């Protein structure tokens, strides 16, 4: 969909970190349904020889299941699903600002006209300072840009949607870092189980060992590190968003670089898309600036009239 122009480097890094987090969550959930198990042995009273517990195989299985659903804490068995939910939430918000239908149509029109301006030779002719069909195409693209300027600059939906998206991402990162970090050392290999099923097996206290505890702890540490990098990138994005006021876009530098100075000050959502493209590459910003100049309009009209006469 050629949406990579709109996404800056920090957004690409956030998307790739979300992909890696989703992969980690899926891998953790694969093991949490394949080999997630606890093995429990009863605490018996006091040439070495083994201790006979007088328990059947299925009594041991019953004890294991009961202690898995009672002794094992919720964060030692539900982390991969919470990680999957968090990755889904982060990935949905990542593409949300161009998936909402109004903003999607606006950004699609913006990308289309930006590509048309980039492929327009009239921009190169104006920057360096033709044909009747080329002049007609240039006039049509100028009129399309004129219609687009009134279509987008009136509203501020895209900027507000992006602000809401990054605020939601930052809040989710803060919540994940606050609640996940408190439950790191709480994951332990051994677990003391008191299932109160002595009338079925004969033992009151069972000592269990969660098999998927150390690997789950390493995956938790890796997820915490990745989400910390993600939060740092999101905080940098917030600082950039609140650094430059994106409600307006001064073309003073563009009008100074170019030979045309009749470029209006683009504001609102039209300014936000131009700022994102400038964060991507300033060439398209120069193209739009020279296509928004009235002196270029006068030059194009004069060229068309000279072609006609």
């Amino acid at each position: 969909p050629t949406y990579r122009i709109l996404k800056p480097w920090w957004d690409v890094f956030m998307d790739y970190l979300a992909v890696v987090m989703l992969m980690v969550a899926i891998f953790a959930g694969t093991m949490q349904l394949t080999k997630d198990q606890v093995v429990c042995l009863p605490v018996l009273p006091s040439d070495p020889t083994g201790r006979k517990t007088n328990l059947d195989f299925q009594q041991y299985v019953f004890i294991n299941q009961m202690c898995y659903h009672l002794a094992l804490p919720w964060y030692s068995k539900y982390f991969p699903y919470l990680a999957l939910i968090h990755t889904i939430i982060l990935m949905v918000s990542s593409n949300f600002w161009f998936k909402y239908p109004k903003t999607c149509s606006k950004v699609e029109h913006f990308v289309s006209i930006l590509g048309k301006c980039f492929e327009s030779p009239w921009t190169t002719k104006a920057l360096s300072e033709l044909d009747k069909k080329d002049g007609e195409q240039a006039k049509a693209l100028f009129e399309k840009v004129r219609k687009f300027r009134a279509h987008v600059e009136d509203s501020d939906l895209i900027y507000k949607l992006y602000v809401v998206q990054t605020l939601i991402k930052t809040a989710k990162f803060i919540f994940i870092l606050c609640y996940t970090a408190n439950f790191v050392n709480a994951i332990s290999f051994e677990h003391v189980c008191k299932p109160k099923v002595e009338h079925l097996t004969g033992y009151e206290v069972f000592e269990c060992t969660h098999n998927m505890a150390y690997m789950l702890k390493k995956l938790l540490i890796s997820y915490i590190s990745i989400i910390c990098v993600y939060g740092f990138i999101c905080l940098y994005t917030l600082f950039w968003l609140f650094r430059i006021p994106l409600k307006e876009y001064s073309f003073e530098k563009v009008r100074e670089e170019s030979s045309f100075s009749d470029i209006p000050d683009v504001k609102n959502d039209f300014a936000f898309l131009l700022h994102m493209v400038d964060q991507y590459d300033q060439l398209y910003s120069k193209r739009f600036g020279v296509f928004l100049s009235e002196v270029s309009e006068n030059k194009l009209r004069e060229i068309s009239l000279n072609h006609e006469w």
């Binding site: 690409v12 694969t30 605490v43 328990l55 390493k218």
Partner: protein, 308 residues
């Protein structure tokens, strides 16, 4: 695809070696998650008849789990995950300049302009006339001039490529250090003493690791692949540091071709032209037509002749 011209033979070799490494990592992770266990038997004393231990099956499973998670070496347990992380790091660093937007836009522009110059017949005419052909030729000349005045000011691509190569070679050094140092610990039979006498009745257990030999063989093959990858990265560093890639020389091309006024390019332009020369010098020689001013003068003269 269209960006394969910017990948020299060392880049392709590193990509394929990393693909093989990723396959090894996936196979090792599949083995470790599913099949990896540790069968343990207690030591009774620290016609033939069997030795009875009076241990239940779940007591054996508990002993196996405890001695697998306690007295087994960390490298034998987490071998393929480190390999997977290293493969992901290598894949990210190899194509980091294809994903950074500031360098990605320049790479896209360079590839498109090089392909357009290669497909143009004006190069064939110069090395040896429709109005559309002349118009497209002069537009290509103008956009080549714009590309040269836009790219030569900055050297972001060369610095990023140098950083990626340095990161890859230091990662190779770290891998070939730590994996080699921690490769003797993958052994079949590992004794364990976990002090679970209160639950089972025995102190020391003699365990066996069923996947120890296959993990050792995979580690040896991964070490060999890392050695090859590091040798290729060392060659890449030597090629980058042999000549100043920020400056390109057109002496051979201008001596072979009729035009002898081709200026030298600098910064990312020179590095990209060096990469193209390492891929195929024909593309760079064909692209060199759109840099000489004599070719522009000849094109203007032909356009004027078509006008009159």
């Amino acid at each position: 695809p269209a960006y394969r011209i910017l990948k020299p033979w060392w880049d392709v070799f590193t990509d394929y070696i990393s693909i093989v490494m990723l396959m090894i990592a996936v196979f090792g992770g599949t083995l470790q998650v599913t099949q990896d266990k540790m069968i343990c038997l207690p030591c009774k004393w620290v016609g033939p008849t069997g030795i009875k231990y009076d241990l239940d099956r779940h007591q054996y499973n508990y002993v196996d789990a405890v001695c697998y998670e306690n007295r087994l070496h960390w490298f034998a347990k987490y071998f393929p995950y480190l390999v997977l992380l290293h493969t992901l790091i290598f894949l990210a660093c190899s194509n980091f300049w294809f994903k950074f937007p500031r360098t990605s836009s320049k790479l896209e522009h360079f590839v498109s302009i090089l392909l357009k110059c290669f497909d143009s017949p004006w190069t064939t005419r110069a090395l040896s006339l429709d109005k559309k052909e002349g118009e497209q030729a002069k537009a290509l000349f103008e956009k080549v001039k714009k590309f040269r005045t836009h790219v030569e000011e900055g050297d972001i691509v060369y610095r990023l490529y140098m950083r990626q190569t340095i990161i890859k070679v230091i990662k190779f050094a770290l891998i070939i250090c730590y994996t080699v140092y921690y490769v003797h610990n993958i052994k079949f039979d590992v004794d364990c003493t976990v002090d679970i006498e209160s639950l089972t009745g025995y102190r020391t257990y003699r365990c066996a690791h069923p996947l120890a030999t296959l993990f050792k063989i995979l580690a040896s093959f991964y070490i060999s692949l890392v050695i090859f990858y590091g040798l290729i990265c060392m060659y890449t560093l030597w090629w980058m540091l042999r000549r100043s890639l920020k400056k390109y020389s057109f002496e051979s091309i201008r001596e072979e071709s009729s035009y002898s006024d081709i200026p030298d390019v600098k910064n990312d332009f020179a590095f990209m032209l060096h990469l193209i020369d390492q891929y195929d010098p024909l593309y760079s020689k064909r692209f060199a037509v759109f840099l000489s001013e004599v070719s522009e003068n000849k094109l203007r003269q032909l356009n004027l002749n078509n006008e009159w």
